[PDB]
Amino acid sequence: DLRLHLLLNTSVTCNDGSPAGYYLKESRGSRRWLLFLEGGWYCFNRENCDSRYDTMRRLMSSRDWPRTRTGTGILSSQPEENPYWWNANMVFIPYCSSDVWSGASSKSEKNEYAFMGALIIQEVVRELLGRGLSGAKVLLLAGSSAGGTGVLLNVDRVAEQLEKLGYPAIQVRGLADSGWFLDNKQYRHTDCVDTITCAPTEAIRRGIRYWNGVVPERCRRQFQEGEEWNCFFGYKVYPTLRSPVFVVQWLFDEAQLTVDNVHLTPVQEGLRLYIQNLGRELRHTLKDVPASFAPACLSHEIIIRSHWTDVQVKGTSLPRALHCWDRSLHPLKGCPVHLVDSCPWPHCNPSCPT
Ligand SMILES: CC1CCN(Cc2c[nH]c3ccccc23)CC1
Numbered sequence: 001d002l003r004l005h006l007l008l009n010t011s012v013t014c015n016d017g018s019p020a021g022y023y024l025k026e027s028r029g030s031r032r033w034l035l036f037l038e039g040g041w042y043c044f045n046r047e048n049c050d051s052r053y054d055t056m057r058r059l060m061s062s063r064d065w066p067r068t069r070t071g072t073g074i075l076s077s078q079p080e081e082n083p084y085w086w087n088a089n090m091v092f093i094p095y096c097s098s099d100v101w102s103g104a105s106s107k108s109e110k111n112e113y114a115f116m117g118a119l120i121i122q123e124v125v126r127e128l129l130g131r132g133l134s135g136a137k138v139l140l141l142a143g144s145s146a147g148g149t150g151v152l153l154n155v156d157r158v159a160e161q162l163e164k165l166g167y168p169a170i171q172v173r174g175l176a177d178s179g180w181f182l183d184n185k186q187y188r189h190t191d192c193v194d195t196i197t198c199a200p201t202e203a204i205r206r207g208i209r210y211w212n213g214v215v216p217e218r219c220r221r222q223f224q225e226g227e228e229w230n231c232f233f234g235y236k237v238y239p240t241l242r243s244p245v246f247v248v249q250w251l252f253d254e255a256q257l258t259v260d261n262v263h264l265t266p267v268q269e270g271l272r273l274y275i276q277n278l279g280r281e282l283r284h285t286l287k288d289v290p291a292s293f294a295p296a297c298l299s300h301e302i303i304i305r306s307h308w309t310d311v312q313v314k315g316t317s318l319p320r321a322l323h324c325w326d327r328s329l330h331p332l333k334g335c336p337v338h339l340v341d342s343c344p345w346p347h348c349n350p351s352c353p354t
Pocket residue numbers: 015016017018061063112113
């Protein structure tokens with residue numbers, strides 16, 4: 001049950017200029033630290049950010065944040081719920097920048113909102129070092145959905161940040177949940193004229209300009225000016241990262257089907273082959289990712305659900321795979337790290353959530 005701390009450096013703000021922050025449950029008998037990045041879409045122009053402020057203000061402001069918040073799934077401190085890291089120091093960073101954790105722009109004359117996702121992370125790490133992070137041995141940067149993509153964009157900074165601050169011995173790692181998207185062909189098409197018709201490739205390219213967005217340097221050097229949107233897609237940015245990153249991704253992610261303009265509520269040849277192709281292509285992008293967990297389910301997010309221990313791939317649950325990943329960073333008999341389903345339809349894995 002984690003306690004809120006608003007950032008001491010008041011220049012690092014949410015969208016509306018209110019200070020950003022983090023929730024902390026500290027565990028003095030542990031040198032392990034878990035920093036979780038919240039998700040929740042994004043906004044890429046004035047009009048859609050304005051609408052988001054009326055109906056999703058908690059994702060744009062700290063004004064109405066509660067003082068405590070309860071830890072779930074991987075953020076739980078009970079072994080029964082969290083077999084993986086129940087005794088670790090727990091940190092939940094709320095997503096109030098609407099920029100996929102990439103922005104570095106302040107509010108001012110010329111900017112109605114601030115987009116400081118990359119700087120919010122950066123400062124949480126700084127202030128945590130004065131609360132015990134200085135004695136850590138592993139820092140696991142995790143996140144779900146837009147926070148999952150934020151892990152891929154930010155994990156190597158946090159590594160580079162801690163070396164420049166004199167902490168080269170802390171091992172920085174990443175855990176990206178449901179943030180591994182494909183810029184594939186859509187099932188039905190629309191031109192980018194408003195929020196709901198703009199495909200993520202077009203929406204992200206406009207967002208980076210609007211946010212002053214920042215991407216990892218090696219990926220930036222590959223795709224070069226004005227093609228930085230490529231680095232928000234996992235299979236393109238992952239090969240540029242030096243930190244160890246574990247990738248969790250449903251094969252038939254609900255958010256991926258949404259941006260592909262697919263709805264499930266009588267499926268035919270047209271759509272059957274489309275859905276089957278989607279599972280095939282994302283399985284392909286994971287073939288050479290040594291640490292991964294990809295079940296054949298229709299869902300979205302998992303690592304902070306309380307029942308995250310129920311899903312299995314080839315008999316191995318997600319908390320076990322993460323524990324096997326820790327062992328491999330010291331192949332392991334009966335303790336695998338690469339777990340990708342091979343059956344081709346949603347919920348062909350019986351452990352899929354209902
Ligand atoms: C201190 C908080 C931030 C400001 N206020 C609303 C507000 C004033 N100006 C704005 C510009 C952009 C977005 C929101 C606002 C709510 C509480």
